[PDB]
Amino acid sequence: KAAAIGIDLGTTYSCVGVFQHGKVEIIANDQGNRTTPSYVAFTDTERLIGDAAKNQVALNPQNTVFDAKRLIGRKFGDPVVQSDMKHWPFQVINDGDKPKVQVSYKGETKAFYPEEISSMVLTKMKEIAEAYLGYPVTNAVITVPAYFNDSQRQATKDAGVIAGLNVLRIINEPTAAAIAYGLDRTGKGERNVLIFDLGGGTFDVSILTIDDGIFEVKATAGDTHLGGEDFDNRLVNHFVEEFKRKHKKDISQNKRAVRRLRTACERAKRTLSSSTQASLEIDSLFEGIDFYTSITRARFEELCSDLFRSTLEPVEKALRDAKLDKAQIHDLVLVGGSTRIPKVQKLLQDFFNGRDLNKSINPDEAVAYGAAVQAAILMG
Ligand SMILES: Nc1ncnc2c1ncn2[C@@H]1O[C@H](COP(=O)(O)OP(=O)(O)O)[C@@H](O)[C@H]1O
Ligand SMILES: [Mg+2]
Ligand code: NA
Numbered sequence: 010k011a012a013a014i015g016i017d018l019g020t021t022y023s024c025v026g027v028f029q030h031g032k033v034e035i036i037a038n039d040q041g042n043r044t045t046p047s048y049v050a051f052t053d054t055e056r057l058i059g060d061a062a063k064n065q066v067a068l069n070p071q072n073t074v075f076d077a078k079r080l081i082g083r084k085f086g087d088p089v090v091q092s093d094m095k096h097w098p099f100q101v102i103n104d105g106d107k108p109k110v111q112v113s114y115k116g117e118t119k120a121f122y123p124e125e126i127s128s129m130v131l132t133k134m135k136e137i138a139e140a141y142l143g144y145p146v147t148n149a150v151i152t153v154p155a156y157f158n159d160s161q162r163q164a165t166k167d168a169g170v171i172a173g174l175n176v177l178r179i180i181n182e183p184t185a186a187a188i189a190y191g192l193d194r195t196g197k198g199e200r201n202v203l204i205f206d207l208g209g210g211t212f213d214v215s216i217l218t219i220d221d222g223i224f225e226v227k228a229t230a231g232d233t234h235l236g237g238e239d240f241d242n243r244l245v246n247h248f249v250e251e252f253k254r255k256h257k258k259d260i261s262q263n264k265r266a267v268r269r270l271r272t273a274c275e276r277a278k279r280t281l282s283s284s285t286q287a288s289l290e291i292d293s294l295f296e297g298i299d300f301y302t303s304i305t306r307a308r309f310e311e312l313c314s315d316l317f318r319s320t321l322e323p324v325e326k327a328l329r330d331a332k333l334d335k336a337q338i339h340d341l342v343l344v345g346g347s348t349r350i351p352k353v354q355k356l357l358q359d360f361f362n363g364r365d366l367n368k369s370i371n372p373d374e375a376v377a378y379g380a381a382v383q384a385a386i387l388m389g
């Protein structure tokens with residue numbers, strides 16, 4: 010009985026799980042990581058996926074693809090595509106009203122549909138699963154945002170088929186998170202569930218009604234350009250200003266210095282979820298000058314205060330659209346890596362008058378956890 014896997018094909022990070030023996034195994038990749046960047050890179054010599062793409066020793070911005078999930082299933086002329094293109098370092102081209110990402114690989118220009126890019130991330134997730142299981146995987150559940158339309162769903166499925174998978178079902182992210190917590194097991198009688206999902210790039214609030222195992226999506230809200238990367242960017246700008254103060258040099262036009270600082274800021278952020286301060290130490294940041302400093306949790310919170318507070322507006326809106334009072338939410342579920350931030354948890358819990366948060370499943374894994382549960386259900 011060869012297991013089906015569950016894949017969270019994320020905007021910024023993806024995750025794969027498998028259900029066996031009554032229990033989900035979230036599968037670590039070859040570097041030991043339980044999540045894997047949704048990044049593909051092309052060089053003079055190789056195609057890199059995941060951690061190797063995100064962590065290249067040498068900047069390759071034109072040929073390092075990410076955010077494919079923002080393109081998948083959309084027409085080239087979609088306002089969202091045209092908007093997003095302006096900020097990406099890689100080129101997007103029109104092929105018969107469909108976007109393609111164009112890069113250089115082994116010295117030749119070529120282009121890929123978003124579903125081909127995303128198939129490369131799914132193949133990596135498949136391979137991570139296969140390395141753990143010891144045999145080929147042929148069946149999967151793949152998740153998508155609740156707001157995805159038929160074309161975005163179909164393109165995600167087609168990314169799965171490309172990758173060699175039989176896609177058992179495409180299921181919504183917030184539904185997968187609820188399944189992870191066993192909330193689908195409820196009997197007859199409506200239960201309202203709020204899923205608060207703050208990831209790397211996007212913020213999604215969904216309100217679900219579950220009644221005897223049947224899910225209805227009652228409301229969706231959020232901000233497609235609010236996520237952990239924006240918090241990293243506030244720390245970057247802070248530290249650029251601190252380096253000018255101390256060294257009388259502006260690092261901001263040095264692409265490598267900014268990248269290294271951003272990576273260091275992301276790591277210090279994560280530390281600040283469990284400690285009240287973090288050390289940020291980068292050798293030879295700019296013109297040979299070491300930058301050894303630190304950041305407190307309080308200061309981080311100040312830097313990002315408007316961003317964190319803004320997460321409550323979509324929560325209000327979703328409650329209004331679902332025609333529900335706070336007290337009528339039965340369960341609050343945290344999804345997305347950025348939900349580990351203490352101040353974000355505080356804001357939400359305070360808004361809900363002290364209500365417990367369902368947070369025992371690592372929030373960046375919950376989607377995959379549920380998709381793995383559901384893939385085994387569907388296999389029978
Ligand atoms: N311990 C942590 N504290 C703060 N943020 C974190 C923590 N762990 C992960 N994150 C952040 O979570 C984001 C990724 O969220 P994730 O849910 O894995 O992906 P995606 O949004 O693709 O679904 C990144 O911005 C990352 O820095
Ligand atoms: Mg996510
Ligand atoms: Na993810």
Ligand code: NA
Nearest residue numbers: 206208211212
């Ligand atoms: Na999200």
